Amino acid sequence: DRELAILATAENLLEDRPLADISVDDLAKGAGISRPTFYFYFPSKEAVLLTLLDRVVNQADMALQTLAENDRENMWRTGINVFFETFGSHKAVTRAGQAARATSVEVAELWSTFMQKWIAYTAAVIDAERDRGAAPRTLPAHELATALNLMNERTLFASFAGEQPSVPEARVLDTLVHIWVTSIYGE
Amino acid sequence: DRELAILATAENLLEDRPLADISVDDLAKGAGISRPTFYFYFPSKEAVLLTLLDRVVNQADMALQTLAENDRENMWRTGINVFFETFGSHKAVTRAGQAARATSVEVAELWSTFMQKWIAYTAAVIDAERDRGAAPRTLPAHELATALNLMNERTLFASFAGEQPSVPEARVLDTLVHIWVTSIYGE
């Protein structure tokens, strides 16, 4: 309500500048509320970012669950694309959220909890592919899954932030899908 | 001299706690010098970390140049192993150096300059492998190289920091080499 206005303001301001350069007064002003009214909904601007990141992570997780409840190259591409579109639609929050992992235990723990879930699901799909005889028994599935998820984390976030170096955003899906399919199916 | 003692002290203290929890007075005391004598060799504790990271990055780069001036799976493993051993021998500096990328333009630019070099060298070796007919012309070599280097950055540093999630350090070389060889040679 006022909560949503605060969150919408924070997402808008993060498009232009870092959390460090955004005051509680900036978020209050943008949301049309006082400073003490702000503090009724959120203990800090840090908790605003935690809630924004929580919503974006849950949106991606819910989109991947929808896919899971329904060719091998297209199967992986469709799944990687959940993360590309979801985080790529929320670049300001992605970026600020990754930077807050260093300073926020709640942000580090949110990101860690979802990465463990996404890795466990990746490993379960590789195992299914091995069980049906489509993928060879090479590396431990859980270790392969970990490295691939870490690759995607670093490569997606570098591309969205326009880091040097980065894969251009228009090439990153093809790039990741190639490495996933060759490393999962390759003998 | 006193410079080396300051650097050795900083590396020792970073084994126990973050830069934020290390004072110029801590580095001076450890190096057996006064606070103003410290400031003669370094403008700040941040510049000490920049110099430590500079030395570790150059050690890895010089080891990779030595290799370059001399089976396909073993060739990539030997090269990845430069980074595994070099950064893995300097875990405190690696960790503090990666955290300083967020706050230090000099640290962000050092890391970016060497990543561009290492990616350009990776791409040149893939191209050579394609030219000799050992590797298929799949992805653009420079884009494949970028994602693989980013994977290694994230996966090595997660393992060395014992992050959750991470590939166990005793499995990370096998894990990365498998993804490199299948993605470089796989059709």
Ligand SMILES: CS(=O)(=O)NCC#Cc1ccc(S(=O)(=O)NCCC(F)(F)F)cc1
């Ligand atoms: C259509 S399907 O059945 O759902 N395909 C199977 C799948 C899947 C799957 C895809 C991508 C990733 S990840 O590595 O991209 N996510 C980590 C967060 C990051 F994006 F930060 F990496 C993880 C799992």
Ligand SMILES: CS(=O)(=O)NCC#Cc1ccc(S(=O)(=O)NCCC(F)(F)F)cc1
């Ligand atoms: C024996 S040889 O001829 O030298 N083999 C060819 C090679 C190579 C080569 C290996 C590993 C990497 S990287 O991706 O590990 N480094 C990025 C820094 C990071 F470690 F942070 F990633 C880059 C290039």
